[PDB]
């Protein structure tokens, strides 16, 4: 099961799955230094510190602390990352590759400005929030939930993670950065103007191609 089902996951998402599961395993046993991944913002303001521009963006010391929190955010991702790929994203992976970088650089710059340490939840809920607005207008009702009306998901989910824990900064920034990107990528071109001045380079398409309907060959006209 572990073999084929993991391969059944799309390579882009399966790579995200591998990154999110392998790191906590090393942390719980503790081979590498747990303190080696902290992302000191003040050190960045003084020195470039090319050691950790990316390393602390996937590390999380899950365990006796916020153990339950890591499980759930990974859980909605697993239950909903697959869904959103199937939603208007199968034929455009290069576009779906792009905005993943856009939120990641947006949260870290706001993250480097302030003094938080673990930007784990923001990168999960940002894309999850982007899913909701770009995939609105369905009713969902799970077994232990209520019969809340459609298009309420981004707001009802927003309160849930906020009240469990804290750190008001990360929840607020992740939603608004999705909000502005939702307005910029989707709403801005036909609102006033300012079209897609973020076009993905051909190098991205060269690495991973898009999908086009293969016509094939037409038999004949008949008669």
């Amino acid at each position: 099961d572990i073999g084929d089902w993991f391969r059944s996951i799309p390579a882009i998402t399966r790579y995200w799955f591998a990154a999110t599961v392998a790191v906590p395993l090393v942390g719980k046993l503790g081979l590498i230094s747990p303190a080696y991944l902290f992302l000191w913002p003040e050190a960045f303001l003084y020195r470039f510190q090319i050691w950790r521009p990316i390393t602390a963006t996937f590390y999380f010391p899950v365990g006796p602390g916020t153990g339950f929190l890591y499980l759930v955010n990974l859980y909605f991702l697993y239950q909903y990352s697959t869904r959103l790929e199937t939603g208007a994203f199968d034929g455009r992976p290069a576009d779906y590759l792009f905005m993943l970088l856009f939120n990641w650089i947006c949260i870290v710059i706001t993250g480097l400005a302030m003094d938080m340490q673990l930007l784990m939840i923001p990168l999960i809920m940002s894309v999850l929030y982007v899913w909701a607005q770009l995939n609105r207008d369905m009713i969902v009702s799970f077994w232990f939930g209520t019969r809340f009306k459609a298009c309420y998901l981004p707001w009802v989910i927003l309160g849930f993670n906020y009240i469990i824990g804290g750190s008001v900064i990360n929840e607020l920034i992740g939603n608004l950065v999705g909000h502005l990107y939702f307005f910029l990528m989707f709403r801005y071109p036909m609102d006033l103007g300012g079209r897609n001045f973020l076009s993905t380079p051909q190098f991205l398409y060269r690495w991973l191609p898009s999908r086009r309907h293969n016509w094939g060959q037409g038999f004949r006209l008949g008669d």
Binding site: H213, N214, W215, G216, Q217, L221, G222, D223
Partner: protein
């Protein structure tokens, strides 16, 4: 607006036709061959061609299943119609099949499905639609997934069809055209009119019944033999009106565990209560709710009383119709008949001779029969079959056409080419073979039908013919003058006369003339429950006649029980009164509103008990006499309906040598005369075949048999071996009884 109309189903398929009345097109600036735009719910558009219809009304438009499915509408809705004859020829069309229809087919689908479909049709197609093609052995549906120019295009003789690619996955908003509908039932024209009338209103417009404040139906009970198509009426009605058919079964409720069978019923009505207007089908009701005396345990007394408390809990809320199916309406618990529960009852009998033909043309629609199959012949010689049996006969005969062609497909591949499938054909040689090893399941069951005997099938006795006509037609066809006066039309007639004179033929003939059902109860059948078995049988037979009104019940050889009483002991004389008492008890209960006619035949009129003959019951005495001369030749003509052309037969000469015989004996004479003629022709061909042993194929002229040349001397020689069946003592006994009754 002169655009919105009501829709209804068609007959002549033709996935791109609609039937409209002539004045409607005349006033809507429409002309022949004009393509039109049809628009309905969900902003869906279908393009069709219009043509005139003979019997189409103004506000009703006739269209088949496929056009309705594209528009996402149902029966009796409203559509938008507008002429747009400005379509531009398409260039390249990309048509692909649906995934769950081409399992293991492959081959070239273009040249055996699409090629004969678009050829010389100029079909106008629109993007996103679905059409169904009757294949060689299957029915494969396609989906126009791309067109150029988009989306309106008419298929032209110069168009490039790109029919390659993986099949499209089935989406969720379709209704799966390959499912049951109102056109998938035959032989149930009247019953499907009743079910559709009582159900279409509570299920299509639930809101109206709340404002009107009247009581909707809450239970329908269909009964009949197994295999006659009951759970197909419940599946057809739910699929067309739009509902949430939720089947619960008989056996799997009774065998879950201990006390949790009940929690299966309690949570079965829950989905139907929160899932829109629903319909619940409880199959095999007699398995879970039998009579109180056959429930020997306790946990079978818990299920029944759990079914009753759930039915009485259906007071308005959502509209939920619960229908049940049972084999015999006597085996159901009597508590499931009170009002608020199963009250409306429908009967699905076995099909008749014109019904068995319609089941044939439904199941064989997919196959490709050869040009020698006479479906009329197979229909009329399969009495005793139910709907489900004729669906196996048409399958066994299909298997021969591949069993005898197995070499062509020797091990093939995992997928079978479509070219060979369209090359197959089924002949009478297969159908006669599948008929041999078939076991019909109806057999011993009382058949209710309109017999085909005509007046001309009996000769003479026209005075009796007028007499019976007076007592049947006039009381029901012209009742107004009977309404005046306290006239009581006769409820019965008794026939008495010499045996074998044509009593049963008269009762059959009158039923055919009035076009009413006929039910016959024989003598030996009447003594079947006379001993041991209770008199419950004699009850349902009258209820059987009651439901099929109008009908002509027939009691044959009524004096059978009296003869058994007459004997050395006749200990059953009181027992012989049992059946008579029950017959008497259930003969005075008939109402004048329902039209039921009782006819009893007898041959010992002096032995019938005086209790039966009484005013208010069967009381008209009719004496059937032996046919006389000119009438006695008409009996002989009743066997000339065969082909006994005996040269210059001179039937008038044959008339004068046939003096003083009975009725049924004369037909035996023709059969006896014909029997030796068949035998004599055997020696002629036996002589011919053994003479051909000398000459090898020396036949310049093609002739194998003397071609039935029936002779008169051969007929005459048989008549010499004939004796009179008329007994002088017997006819004298009746005539003096006739005079005694006369005077």
């Amino acid at each position: 607006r002169p655009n919105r109309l009501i829709v209804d189903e068609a007959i002549n398929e033709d996935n791109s036709v609609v039937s409209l009345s002539q004045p409607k097109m005349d006033e809507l600036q429409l002309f022949r061959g004009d393509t039109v735009l049809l628009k309905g719910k969900k902003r869906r558009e279908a393009v069709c061609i219009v043509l005139s219809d003979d019997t189409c009304s103004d506000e009703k438009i006739r269209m088949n299943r496929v056009v309705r499915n594209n528009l996402r509408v149902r029966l009796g809705d409203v559509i938008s119609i507008q002429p747009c004859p400005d379509v531009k020829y398409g260039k390249r069309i990309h048509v692909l099949p649906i995934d769950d229809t081409v399992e293991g087919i492959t081959g070239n689908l273009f040249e055996v499905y699409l090629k004969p479909y678009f050829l010389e049709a100029y079909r106008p197609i629109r993007k996103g639609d679905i059409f169904l093609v009757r294949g060689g052995m299957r029915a494969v549906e396609f989906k126009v997934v791309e067109t150029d120019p988009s989306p309106y295009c008419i298929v032209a003789p110069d168009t490039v069809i790109h029919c390659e690619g993986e099949p499209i996955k089935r989406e969720d908003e379709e209704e799966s055209l390959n499912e049951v509908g109102y056109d998938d039932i035959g032989g149930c024209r009247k019953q499907l009119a009743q079910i559709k009338e009582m159900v279409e209103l509570p299920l299509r417009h639930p809101a109206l019944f709340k404002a009107i404040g009247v009581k909707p139906p809450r239970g329908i009970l269909l009964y009949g033999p197994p295999g006659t198509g009951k759970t197909l009426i419940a599946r057809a009605v739910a699929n067309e009106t739009g509902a949430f058919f939720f089947l619960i079964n008989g056996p799997e409720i009774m065998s879950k565990l201990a006390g949790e069978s009940e929690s299966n019923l309690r949570k079965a009505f829950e989905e139907a209560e929160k899932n829109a207007p629903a319909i619940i089908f409880i199959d095999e009701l007699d398995a879970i709710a039998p009579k109180r005396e056959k429930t020997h345990g306790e946990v079978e007394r818990r299920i029944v009383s759990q079914l009753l408390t759930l039915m009485d809990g259906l007071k308005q809320r959502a509209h939920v119709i619960v229908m049940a199916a049972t084999n015999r309406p006597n085996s159901i618990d009597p508590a499931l008949r009170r009002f608020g529960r199963f009250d409306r009852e429908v009967d699905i009998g076995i099909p008749d001779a014109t019904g068995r033909l319609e089941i044939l043309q439904i199941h064989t629609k997919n196959m490709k029969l050869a040009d020698d199959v006479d479906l009329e012949q197979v229909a009329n010689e399969t009495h005793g079959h139910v709907g489900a049996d004729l669906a196996a006969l048409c399958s066994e005969a299909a298997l021969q056409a591949i069993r005898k062609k197995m070499d062509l497909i020797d091990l093939e591949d995992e997928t079978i080419d479509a070219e060979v499938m369209n090359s197959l054909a089924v002949t009478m040689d297969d159908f006669r073979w599948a008929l041999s090893q078939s076991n019909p399941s109806a057999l011993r069951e009382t058949v209710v039908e309109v017999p085909q005997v005509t007046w001309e099938d009996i000769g003479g006795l026209e005075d009796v013919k007028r007499e019976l006509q007076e007592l049947v037609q006039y009381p029901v066809e012209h009742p107004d003058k009977f309404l005046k006066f306290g006239m009581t039309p006769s409820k019965g007639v008794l026939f008495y006369g010499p045996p074998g004179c044509g009593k049963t033929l008269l009762a059959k003939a009158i039923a055919n003339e009035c076009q009413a059902n006929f039910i016959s109860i024989k003598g030996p059948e009447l003594l079947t429950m006379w001993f041991g078995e209770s008199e419950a049988n004699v009850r349902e037979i009258f209820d059987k006649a009651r439901q099929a009104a109008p009908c002509v019940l027939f009691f044959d050889e009524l004096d059978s029980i009296a003869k058994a009483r007459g004997g050395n002991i006749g200990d059953g004389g009181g027992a012989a009164d049992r059946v008579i008492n029950q017959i008497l008890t259930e003969m005075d209960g008939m109402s004048t509103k329902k039209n039921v006619f009782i006819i009893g035949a007898t041959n010992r009129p002096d032995i019938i008990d005086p209790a039966i003959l009484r005013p208010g019951r069967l009381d008209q005495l009719i004496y059937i006499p032996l046919p006389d001369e000119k009438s006695r030749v008409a009996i002989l003509k009743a066997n000339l309906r065969k082909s006994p052309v005996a040269k210059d037969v001179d039937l008038e000469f044959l008339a004068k040598m046939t003096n003083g015989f009975s009725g049924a004996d004369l037909t035996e004479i023709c059969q006896r005369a014909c029997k030796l003629a068949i035998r004599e022709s055997i020696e002629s061909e036996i002589r011919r075949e053994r003479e051909r042993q000398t000459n090898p194929s020396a036949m310049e002229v093609e002739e194998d048999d003397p071609v039935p040349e029936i002779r008169r001397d051969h007929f005459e020689e048989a008549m010499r071996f004939a004796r009179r069946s008329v007994s002088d003592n017997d006819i004298r006994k009746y005539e003096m009884f006739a005079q005694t009754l006369q005077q």
